[PDB]
Amino acid sequence: RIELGDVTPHNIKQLKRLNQVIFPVSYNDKFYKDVLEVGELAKLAYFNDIAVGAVCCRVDHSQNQKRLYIMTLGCLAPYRRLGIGTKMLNHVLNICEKDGTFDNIYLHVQISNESAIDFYRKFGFEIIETKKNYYKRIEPADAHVLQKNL
Ligand SMILES: CC(C)(COP(=O)(O)OP(=O)(O)OC[C@H]1O[C@@H](n2cnc3c(N)ncnc32)[C@H](O)[C@@H]1OP(=O)(O)O)[C@@H](O)C(=O)NCCC(=O)NCCS
């Protein structure tokens, strides 16, 4: 019942709308412009052909490593706990497994987001650091850095 589809100029506004409702951070036009250029690293999640979630990633070269950074991964509150997040996370883990050159996968999780910590730890991600004052306009401003070694 869960399918992932490509993000394109035809459905970018559906992605923008989904992110605006799901996430407490507003993303600029450069984020959505970058999204169209990452290809398979950005997907829309459909539940019975209804857009209910999305995943946006970027490649990062830091710590003298090739790293996959998940910027956004989420779905609408009434559709949670159906396997939509797992399908998006498995898709990104599958890109990395096929590619073979990624050292790790990391992301930021606002410290109050207990269900996201639970979700990522279930997949082998670890809290490797807690960045103080990561967010600027939202409370709490601290974010855990979650990382899975590949
Ligand atoms: C975190 C999130 C992405 C998970 O999406 P989801 O579609 O509900 O996840 P799944 O149905 O694939 O859940 C998989 C497993 O994660 C764990 N988990 C997920 N939500 C949980 C919760 N609220 N409490 C406890 N465990 C939870 C469970 O073990 C679950 O397995 P189960 O449902 O078989 O028990 C989702 O809650 C979400 O969209 N959150 C808001 C977005 C956000 O702020 N995330 C920031 C990260 S970028």
Ligand SMILES: CNC(=O)[C@H](CC1CCN(C(=O)c2cc(C(C)(C)C)nn2C)CC1)NC(=O)[C@@H]1CCCC(=O)N1
């Ligand atoms: C305020 N930060 C965020 O919203 C981030 C995403 C944000 C996107 C834009 N952006 C970049 O494009 C970026 C990243 C990098 C790396 C790290 C690779 C060097 N380089 N660039 C240019 C910065 C990061 N996501 C979270 O915090 C998630 C979602 C919100 C809820 C939550 O709990 N967690």
